[PDB]
Every structure is written in structure tokens, then in C-alpha cells.
UniProtKB/Swiss-Prot annotation:
Bridged cysteine pairs (disulfide): none
UniProt domain Bromo: residue ranges: 3-104
Protein family according to the UniProt entry: Belongs to the WAL family.
Expressing tissues: Expressed at moderate levels in most tissues analyzed, including heart, brain, placenta, lung, skeletal muscle, kidney and pancreas.
Identification of the protein by name: Bromodomain adjacent to zinc finger domain protein 2A
Subcellular location: Nucleus, Nucleolus
Length: 105
């Protein structure tokens, strides 16, 4: 399970999931709702996958956790236009994440 040294990451993820702009990213991109996603995006990532990986010991370090957070945002900018609703949400969430992370790094 998660080492207590990563509790600060657990909190950041909780706060991201609560954010207004988090809705596109809470669960894996859903083929019932979005077509052609995995055709373009080789390594999907989302906050529920991160939450399970973190809580069950699948991140050894904060760097691995942060890499998955950035993957959420990098995938979003690969798939979505910047002026789309989901594209805008990804930019908001990247800023929010980086602001929280910078309190530690
Ligand atoms: C600004 N905050 C939120 N949520 C907290 N916005 C969302 C965004 C749009 N929306 C939505 C979008 C869909 O796309 C296929 C399908 C769908 O089926 C239920 C719902 C739900 C509301
Ligand atoms: C209402 C749930 C929902 C609907 C449509 C979505 N689209 C995306 C997304 C993420 N990254 N790219 N897209 C297009 N998440 C979504 C969540």
C-alpha cells in the first residue's frame, strides 16, 4: 500500500478531483462517449487510475506520481483543441497541479 511519505501526493490528487475543471479527467476516457481516443493516445491516464495506483503501492516515488499527472495534461493537449471545453480544462488543471507541486519542489 501507499507509503506515508506520499501522503502529500494523496492530498494533491484529492484536491484535483474536487476541482471545477477536473470533470474530463476523473475516469478513463470513455469509448461510449468519445470516439478515436486510443487511436491517438498511446498511454491514457486519469485521476481514478492514479488514485488506485497511489493507494495500493503502485507509485514508489513522488516523481512517478507527478509523471502520471503530467500525462493526463499532455494527453489532453494532444487530443483536444486548446479552445475546446476539455482543452481549456486541461490547461486549468495543469496550472493547479503545478502550483500545488511547487509548494514542495
Ligand atoms: C463544468 N463542470 C462539469 N461537470 C462537473 N461539466 C460537465 C461537462 C459536460 N457534461 C457532459 C458531457 C458529455 O459529453 C459526451 C456527456 C455527458 O453525459 C452525462 C455530460 C457534464 C457536465
Ligand atoms: C461527462 C463525462 C465526460 C464526457 C466527455 C469527456 N471527454 C473527455 C476527454 C478527456 N480527454 N479528452 N476528452 C475528450 N472526458 C470526458 C468526460
Amino acid at each position: 500500500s501507499m507509503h506515508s511519505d506520499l501522503t502529500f501526493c494523496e492530498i494533491i490528487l484529492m484536491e484535483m478531483e474536487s476541482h471545477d475543471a477536473a470533470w474530463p479527467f476523473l475516469e478513463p476516457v470513455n469509448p461510449r462517449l468519445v470516439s478515436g481516443y486510443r487511436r491517438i493516445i498511446k498511454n491514457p491516464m486519469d485521476f481514478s487510475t492514479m488514485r488506485h495506483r497511489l493507494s495500493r503501492g503502485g507509485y514508489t516515488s513522488s516523481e512517478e506520481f507527478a509523471a502520471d499527472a503530467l500525462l493526463v495534461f499532455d494527453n489532453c493537449q494532444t487530443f483536444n483543441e486548446d479552445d475546446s471545453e476539455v482543452g481549456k480544462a486541461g490547461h486549468i488543471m495543469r496550472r493547479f497541479f503545478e502550483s500545488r507541486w511547487e509548494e514542495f519542489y
